[model samples]
Target: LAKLYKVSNGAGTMSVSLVADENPFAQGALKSEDCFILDHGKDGKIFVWKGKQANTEERKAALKTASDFITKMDYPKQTQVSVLPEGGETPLFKQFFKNWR
Candidate 1:
């Protein structure tokens, strides 16, 4: 019961979109050229994944995106946003995905 979001820099105007939803999220959406956010709803935690080759702006604004996303979506103020730079995903974070470990 969570959602996946993609942060895009369209001509330097950043925007976030829900790229995936439903159970057993897809691993393919974690592309090397973009930033993604995964929220395990009810867990009070949201994880932001920074792709290795992501645009500097997008990569840098990942946390901001996550924070603002919560604000815009009306999530809890203390949702506990965490970030990962591509490869080093935590065991706790991998649980939401299928075969992520």
Candidate 2:
């Protein structure tokens, strides 16, 4: 399974990043200021574009693009999905991934 997150800076421009550990290519394809067009489990390419704050129409279209790609990603029928909620812990660092090093 894979998950994606899109964030807007609430300004004139926005940057993008994604986390898709299920695919090896995802990490390497990431860029600080660009977009990725993935074939999901297969070969894919990235497209660079000037950051533009997505308006309502653009946002809707973007969502559909992602949704269609995700729908076609082949996976086992037994696959399950889960979402973890934020929590307060003894150390804030626990909430962050320590694997970056």
Candidate 2 matches the true fold with a TM-score of 0.26
Which ranges in model 2 have alpha carbons more than 4 Å from their true place?
1-52, 75-101
Candidate 2 minimal-lDDT segment of 10 residues: 81-90
lDDT by residue (tens digit), candidate 2, 36-101: 333222323211211233344434434454444444664333332221212221232221233322
TM-score of each: 0.83, 0.26
Clashing pairs in 2: none
- Per-residue alpha-carbon lDDT of candidate 1 for residues 32-75, written as tens digits (9 for 90 to 100): 88898887635567899999888888876777877776778778
lDDT of 2: 0.33
TM-score of 1: 0.83
Best by TM-score: 1
**For each candidate, how many residue pairs have backbone atoms clashing (under 3 Å)?**
0, 0
In lDDT terms, how accurate is model 1?
Answer: 0.81
lDDT of 2 at 24: 33
